[model samples]
Target: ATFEIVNRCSYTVWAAASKGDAALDAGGRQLNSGESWTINVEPGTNGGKIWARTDCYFDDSGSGICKTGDCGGLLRCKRFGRPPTTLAEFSLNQYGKDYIDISNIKGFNVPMDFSPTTRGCRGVRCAADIVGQCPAKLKAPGGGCNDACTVFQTSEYCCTTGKCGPTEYSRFFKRLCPDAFSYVLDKPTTVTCPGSSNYRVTFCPTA
Candidate 1:
């Protein structure tokens, strides 16, 4: 599947896509406003994530850190990014279908839209300004907003120990982004589409 990633924010965004061990587009790219990046993903990839890093400072060696999503300070990342990152995830050709969703489980950094270009497939977008409206305790250092799990690291927020509901914090996120994954076990808002369809992931999408 061909993946077209666009940047619509006023500033630059370092886009990253990683699936298991297959890091697409060298795993990171700097996209200026109005620019787009494309990557052809192989079929049968079960899981992957796409996100953008903001307020970064990199040297000529592509070594630096981003306030929102940081992957070893490498412009060409090889691993999944850190949290507080609005993300779009997908599965290609998994049992004759593709599953896609935009999740806010980690936190919120930028608005996003994930959808197929061909094949009349449904799309999902997480465009809430969670950073600006973030609770004071969930705010990240440089930028972006952190999930309750990241802050508290407990069973309630992380849902790591046992079954958990959409907690007060997760519900807060749900109110802003209803369709997003508010918590770990929340009903996932995933869409199944044609397996071979081309897709797009837009950062800072406008509606």
Candidate 2:
């Protein structure tokens, strides 16, 4: 998402990441406080820094947004599936992985204000219903419908005693967006089934 700090005042303002000032460009040479500038930033990296000061005015006002955070236009980060997880072990054919990539490109990021999207199963020892849960043997060659994706037998899965949701079968959302925006945490907002228009969804737990 994009957020613009308007410099309506009569002087320039400085805004930057809370951790370090490098995140923002210095603005104060008679720069106005209401003047607008947009930057692409992750929603999680807020409370960094936004300071507005004019020679005449010094009461810098700060605003914070929950969820979508500072980025304006209300175009939230679109996400598909979930973040990386150790849910299963399998090597999908280029076709399968590419299919997921297609949904992200054509379905989520490209059209949705260039927001990014995420996909894949999450958590260790997830229920069988989760997207990444498959029996170890099932992932073997000719094991079953899911086993065909096993490009390598070393892949991991969410087994009863041996959980692998931390890094088993999850992949980051491929960011193919233009570099116009300063930053982006584009996540897959939804995942449409292979042939159907329905969307498959999941989330990470707060705990």
Candidate 3:
């Protein structure tokens, strides 16, 4: 199944996706407002993530840093984006099912929604206004809210040990985005849908 990305935000967003060392159809591009991009991929494409970059300024050489979700300052990112960006994770057609989720575990920049284009799949979202109400210590210098683990390196925040659990800080994120992964131990974040079902990811689906 294919993945379709739609930019509903007012501003432009640099969208990225990758699987292994090879690019999976238009790995990265500048998506203007109301624009959409589609990528065709084989089923069971695991260990791939989709996310958006904001407030970016790339020259003719495509070398520039984004205020949020910078990926090593590269326009075509081979690695995961830096923290403070909403993420749409997927394990498509794995074990006879499609696994997907919207994660705030890295932190929140833009609001996001994920849903199957066809029936037999559930939708997930994390559309909170996290930047406006971010805690003082967890606010990124450029923009967006930093994850607790990013602000504090302790095991309690990073869940370095399996014994680790959620803290008040993690709960704060959960309260806002119940469907998203708020922490390392976030429950009920992953959802499964029928295999080969195309999915749509919308940025700023609502005001």
The candidate that wins on TM-score is: 1
Better of 2 and 3 by lDDT: 3
Candidate 2: worst-modelled 10 consecutive residues by lDDT = 105-114
For model 2, how does the per-residue alpha-carbon lDDT over 1-207 read when each residue is reduced to its tens digit?
A: 233433432333232222233242232222233444554444333222222211122233422221111222111212111111111111122233312111211111101111122334321111122222333432322111122113333334222344333222222212222211111222433222222111111211110
Question: 190, model 3: CA deviation in Å?
Answer: 1.1
Q: How many clashes in each structure? A: 0, 42, 0
Give me the runs in candidate 2 sitting further than 4 Å from their true place.
21-30, 53-207
Q: What is the alpha-carbon lDDT of model 1 when measured against the actual structure?
A: 0.87
> Could you tell me which 10 consecutive residues in candidate 1 have the lowest summed lDDT?
19-28
Model 1: which residue pairs collide?
none
Model 1: lDDT of residue 64: 93
Off by over 4 Å in 1: none
RMSD of 3: 1.3
Instruction: Give the Cα error of residue 58 in candidate 3, in Å.
Output: 1.3
Error of 1 at 113 (Å): 0.8
